[PDB]
């Protein structure tokens, strides 16, 4: 089995999958809404209890077994083969809606290449009767039905929501946005076909370019008037909110969505590695800096919308009343065009949203191609240049339901209802498989032989008690009441939760089927055919 090139190669990819473009809007918006500066207090207690040790055990299975996604269960407990088959179809399900997010930013790159941006004026073919964002000298008013010019460029031209009605009519995919999918998917295919050799070099440019982009964008907001109003609503501690049980669960779901452990993507990094490296130091620095990136990237957004609170003359909660991916392309996009030298700052920000998205889908394609190779030798991936080409075309044709004119409605149901509870259910079932079924007394023996020391008292109790109980509280309150996903004054029908749960449980129905697949083919006494499939060979 091959390995990485240098030592710092695979330490740069674990942080690169940990950070994405989701860390700039999904984290700091729940901070400002739920008590301001008091939201950082559950961010550091729930990380050491549920975030960090569950992030650590996924590397420990990949370090010793040095196998893929599906073959690690062959030497632990073979009934849990449905875990690795579940994450394969979510990787086809994630790549349908996730690549459209940078495709909106890739269209913004060619649109903002000119000197005159279309966001500082209403000189276009949108609904110009509501495009009245010019701030005159006390002769300006907007009726309930008015819109923003950043919204009209997002809804009329890119998504074309006027051409559709909702889930009943999706129609004909935009041809201009379809060309952006071909520009994205070319760079994905030309970096994974060789393996870890080209994957070890492409991250050297794409994982540090957004980090230097956070530095040049912070000095823009630092010497910016009205930036002190944004840090006021961000840092003010409100301890009256923490008595509610709702803010505790939403803070616990944020750390799990940011790092994203147990999905099978990260264990491919530890498979192509020597056993002599300290996994304790490699896992501790990644979870520490990821809180540091989400703290720094909250400063570059809230200091700019504080200037929007000055010009539009409202509170920062009123200008940020939306909740979702529209925080970057509606509110933050219009703030760049009103700045001097707007041609330079618009490119470096919208290319930052490009590079943070492609690091997550660089590694996500490696986790699905490594699984089919080791379980079926000399059957799949005999020629590595051809068999990964069959993988990339399936998520290309699968994304045709997301490139429609009603494409904004399908990415809302698939992010929250479909892939939302699916990533918790696949991660809780693997947490009890290694802890209870495989045994906590057996698991620490493989860690001390590759390191040289036994783990402490904190790591032994939290692997059996805290980490199964950490994901149980989040999945219970999520299946309490179906929320109403409001997207541009269009209310979803009552059967939207029915179709949303059915596409979400299609991966979750695979795991009770795959435990039933082996108890049929394995003959003998009903007690003996089970216990043969818990204890490995």
């Amino acid at each position, epitope marked *: 089995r091959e390995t990485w090139g240098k030592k710092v190669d695979f330490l740069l990819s674990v942080i690169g999958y940990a950070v994405d473009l989701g860390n700039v809007w999904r984290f700091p918006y729940i901070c400002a809404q739920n008590g301001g500066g008091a939201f950082l207090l559950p961010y550091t207690i729930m990380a050491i209890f549920g975030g960090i040790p569950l992030f650590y055990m996924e590397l420990a299975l990949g370090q010793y077994h040095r196998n893929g996604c599906i073959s690690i269960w062959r030497k632990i407990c073979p009934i849990f083969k449905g875990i690795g088959y579940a994450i394969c179809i979510i990787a086809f399900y994630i790549a349908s809606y996730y690549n459209t997010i940078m495709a909106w930013a890739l269209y913004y790159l060619i649109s903002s290449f000119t000197d005159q941006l279309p966001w500082t004026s209403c000189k276009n*073919s*949108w609904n110009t*009767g509501n495009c009245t964002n010019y701030f005159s000298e006390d002769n300006i008013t907007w009726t309930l039905h008015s819109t923003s010019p950043a919204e009209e460029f997002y809804t009329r031209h890119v998504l074309q929501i006027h051409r559709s009605k909702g889930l009943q009519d999706l129609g004909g995919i935009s041809w201009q946005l379809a060309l952006c999918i071909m520009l994205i998917f070319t760079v994905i295919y030309f970096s994974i076909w060789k393996g870890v050799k080209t994957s070890g070099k492409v991250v050297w440019v794409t994982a540090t370019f957004p980090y230097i982009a956070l530095s040049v964008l912070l000095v823009r907001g630092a010497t910016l008037p009205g930036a002190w109003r944004g840090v006021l609503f961000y840092l003010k501690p409100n301890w009256q909110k923490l008595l509610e049980t709702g803010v505790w669960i939403d803070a616990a779901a944020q750390i799990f969505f940011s790092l994203g452990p147990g999905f099978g993507v990260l264990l491919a990094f530890a498979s192509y590695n020597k056993f002599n490296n300290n996994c304790y130091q490699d896992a501790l620095v990644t979870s520490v800096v990821n809180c540091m990136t989400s703290f720094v990237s909250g400063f570059v957004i809230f200091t700019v919308l504080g200037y929007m609170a000055e010009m539009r003359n409202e509170d920062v909660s009123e200008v940020a009343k939306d909740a979702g991916p529209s925080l970057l392309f509606i509110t933050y996009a219009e703030a760049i065009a009103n700045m001097p030298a707007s041609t330079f700052f618009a490119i470096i920000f919208f290319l930052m949203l490009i590079t943070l998205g492609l690091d997550s889908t660089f590694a996500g394609l490696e986790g699905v191609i490594t699984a089919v190779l080791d379980e079926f030798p000399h059957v799949w991936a005999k020629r590595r240049e051809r068999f990964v080409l069959a993988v990339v075309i399936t998520c290309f044709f699968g994304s045709l339901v997301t490139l429609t004119f009603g494409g904004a409605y399908v990415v809302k149901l698939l992010e929250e209802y479909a892939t939302g509870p699916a990533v918790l259910t696949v991660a809780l079932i693997e947490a009890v498989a290694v802890s209870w079924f495989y045994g906590i007394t057996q698991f620490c023996r493989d860690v001390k032989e590759m390191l040289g020391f036994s783990p402490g008292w904190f790591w032994r109790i939290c692997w059996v008690a805290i980490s199964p109980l950490f994901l149980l509280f989040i999945i219970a309150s999520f299946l309490m009441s179906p929320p109403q996903l409001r997207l541009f004054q269009y209310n979803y029908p009552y059967w939207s939760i029915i179709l949303g749960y059915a596409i979400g449980t299609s991966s979750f129905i695979c795991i009770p089927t795959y435990i039933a697949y082996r108890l049929i083919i394995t003959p003998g006494t009903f007690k003996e055919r089970i216990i043969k499939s818990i204890t490995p060979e």
Partner: antibody
Amino acid sequence: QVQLQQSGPELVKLGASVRISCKASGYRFSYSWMNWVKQRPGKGLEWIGRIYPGDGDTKYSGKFKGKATLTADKSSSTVYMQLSSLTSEDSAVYFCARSAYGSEGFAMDYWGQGTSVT
Amino acid sequence: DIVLTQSPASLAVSLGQRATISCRASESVDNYGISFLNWFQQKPGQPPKLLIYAASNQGSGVPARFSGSGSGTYFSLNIHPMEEDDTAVYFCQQTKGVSWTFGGGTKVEI
């Protein structure tokens, strides 16, 4: 309601300058365009240009840049077209029309009375 | 500039008969769903009054004897059985940017 009032007519001679205006009232002229159309008795229509007030963008086509200079101002709430170096063949009828928004397809809902530039 | 012509040059419709008028062009201005093609009606002494919003919806101040539909590179305005008071000229107008071109016009007679 919305009205568009032009100025009086003017006789065309060799080397004269004719200034034509069109006052906008009853709506917000900063969020719309101002179209101009050529009209000759016995011929059809022809597009000249547009004025988008607020920022100063002006588009020219159909070789009318050499004689027609389209300039407007937000404070007095009207537009102007500065004509220069006229001949006898440049005699035509000018109109100003209010353009609708992009949802209606930039249509000319209202029109002026038109001046006789000959 | 986009080439925009008009045919025929003159039509003779009797009392109680229907007709149609088209605008020949190379575009296909069908961008983002809205058909970028307008219609006008200029009378002698009157300005070219608007008829239909983007060849799909009747506007204000227009009588109910006018309609229009079509798709692609060929439209057709639907005219009711006309009377003697409809002596005017109809024009084409493609409003797709950045340069606009107008039609030639046809003579309406009885």
